[PDB]
Amino acid sequence: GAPSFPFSRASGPEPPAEFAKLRATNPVSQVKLFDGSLAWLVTKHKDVCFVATSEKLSKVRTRQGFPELSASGKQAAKAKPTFVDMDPPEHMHQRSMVEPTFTPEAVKNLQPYIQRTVDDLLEQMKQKGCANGPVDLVKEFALPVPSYIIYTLLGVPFNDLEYLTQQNAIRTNGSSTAREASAANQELLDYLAILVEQRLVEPKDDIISKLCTEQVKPGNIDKSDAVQIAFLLLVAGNATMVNMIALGVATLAQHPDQLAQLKANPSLAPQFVEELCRYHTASALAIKRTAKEDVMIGDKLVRANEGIIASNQSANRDEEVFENPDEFNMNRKWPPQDPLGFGFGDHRCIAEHLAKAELTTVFSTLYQKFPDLKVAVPLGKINYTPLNRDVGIVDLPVIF
Ligand code: HEM
């Protein structure tokens, strides 16, 4: 019978062991989901790209056979969809309403702001110090960097960032009760609704204001849609950003020669970030589809109304594309094929340029500020996310 999926990571920082075996012997295979239903799992880079781009496959979650991976996903599929779950032409109709803030040119213009935000959080961390024991790099740094940036871009005023950063963290923290997580979720939605009302009356230079002026007031979307689009932009990427920063620090601690290179030359941060986003694919469960019609993938027939999950994590370890794929090597020579940390095709992460700018700013600055930054617990004792989840780090004690 088909194995249960998601698979568990082989260890804290490693992908599931199953993918390498499937790439070698059964690259398109069936897996069993939490409800006992089946889905196709695609593991090779070429095939993941095919799934990501085929117009015979749909992201619409009300379609029969959609591969929801948990009961919570089934419940979330009942809500009015935003662009993450749309096909053409609806997908770009809505995504284009917010894409302008995320273009390469817009992100380049944001660089001084990104640098200031990182610098200010690093200075707060220095002022707080570590004179009485280690501090949690996640709480002090990896969490607020992406949080402050996305909230600011959306339109949150500076005074409200610390509290809203804490509340959004509660929503996904593994220690929160269901009541606590639900209350934090609703608190964020209530806050965003008030902010939308404010920007309908007096727009400012932020994403919510642009939605209000350009889409809500003309009747292209309503104010509840603006809230849901803003909420999507907050929650889609934030936990992934936090995990990528923490994973980068841990990966450098595990690879001290490459850390020494980066300390001696901060201009290596872009290459470090490229290798990090390939090696630690912290969002590996988002390339999902159902077949609108029969489609052949390799030696398998995916029938109409069957689900498909395309593992970009597996694709990023595909030996046929990336030589020595299971070694972290920021000095590698890159092949012609894209790494897939941010997905592929029409739905490729809207924030890829912003996320890479945040990560590059972090890794070109962190060890200039704190040349003696050290993970304070043994590396084998790092508190990674549970093995049945996307790779990440919950907390990371450090000294400096
Ligand atoms: C290192 C950090 C991040 C990683 C690795 C990442 C990864 C991904 C991946 C794998 C997807 C699926 C793309 C696909 O369907 O092919 C995606 C989509 C998306 N991401 Fe990110 N993401 C990151 C940060 C962010 C941030 C900071 C934001 C928002 C500010 C964000 C917003 C979104 C949205 C809205 C989508 C859906 C795009 C669509 O379906 O059109 N992501 N991301």
Strands 38-42 and 307-310 turn out to be: parallel
Q: Which residue has the tokens 């201009």?
A: 267
What are the angstrom distances between the C-alpha of 156 and each of 30, 63, 190, 197, 277? Answer: 44, 36, 13, 13, 28
Nearest to 274 by CA among 322, 364, 315, 334: 334
d(CA 274, CA 263): 17
Kindly give the distance from the C-alpha atom of residue 351 to the centroid of ligand 1, in angstroms, as a whole number.
Answer: 6
* Data resolution in angstroms: 1.4
Binding-site residues for heme sit at 349
Nearest to 117 by CA among 151, 92, 80: 151
Nearest to 312 by CA among 14, 51, 4: 51
Q: What is the CATH number of the domain that holds 364?
A: 1.10.630.10
Q: Which residue has the tokens 């599929």?
A: 77
The one-letter amino acid code at 398 reads: V
| SS3 annotation, 177-189 | CHHHHHHHHHHHH
| Edge-to-edge strand ranges of the sheet holding 57-58 | 28-32, 38-42, 307-310, 288-291, 57-58
The number of CA neighbours under 13 Å toward the Cβ of 222 is 2
Structural domains counted in the chain: 1
309, 67 Cβ separation under 8 angstroms = yes
Active site residue 390: yes
Two tokens, residue 268: 């290596």
Kindly give the distance from the C-alpha atom of residue 196 to the centroid of ligand 1, in angstroms, as a whole number.
Answer: 23
Look up residue 102 and give its DSSP letter: G
Kindly give the distance from the C-alpha atom of residue 2 to the centroid of ligand 1, in angstroms, as a whole number.
Answer: 29
**Per-position b or e across 14-33, b if 16+ CB within 10 A of its CB:** ebbebbbebbeeebbbbbeb
230, 192 Cβ separation under 8 angstroms = yes
E strand map for the chain = 28-32, 38-42, 57-58, 135-136, 288-291, 295-297, 300-302, 307-310, 374-375, 383-384, 393-395, 397-399
d(CA 270, CA 272): 5
Q: What method did the depositors use to determine the structure? A: X-ray
277, 330 Cβ separation under 8 angstroms = no
d(CA 69, CA 387): 15
290, 57 Cβ separation under 8 angstroms = yes
d(CA 113, CA 77): 36
Residue 279: domain span: 1-400
232: Cβ below 6 Å to ligand 1?
Answer: yes
Q: Among 231, 238, 349, which is best to mutate for testing ligand 1, by the most ligand atoms less than 8 A from CB?
A: 349
d(CA 148, CA 270): 22
Q: Which of 58, 82, 281, 283 is catalytic?
A: 283
Two tokens, residue 174: 């593994």
- The pair phi, psi for residue 84, each rounded to 5°, is -55, -30
Two tokens, residue 109: 């213009």
d(CA 345, CA 54): 9
Give the 3-state secondary structure percentages of the chain, helix then strand then coil, rounded to 5.
50, 10, 40
Neighbours of 363 (CB within 10 A): 24
d(CA 230, CA 346): 20
d(CA 263, CA 207): 36
Q: Which of 82, 240, 281, 361 is catalytic?
A: 240
What are the angstrom distances between the C-alpha of 224 and each of 182, 231, 233, 360, 370? Answer: 19, 11, 14, 35, 44
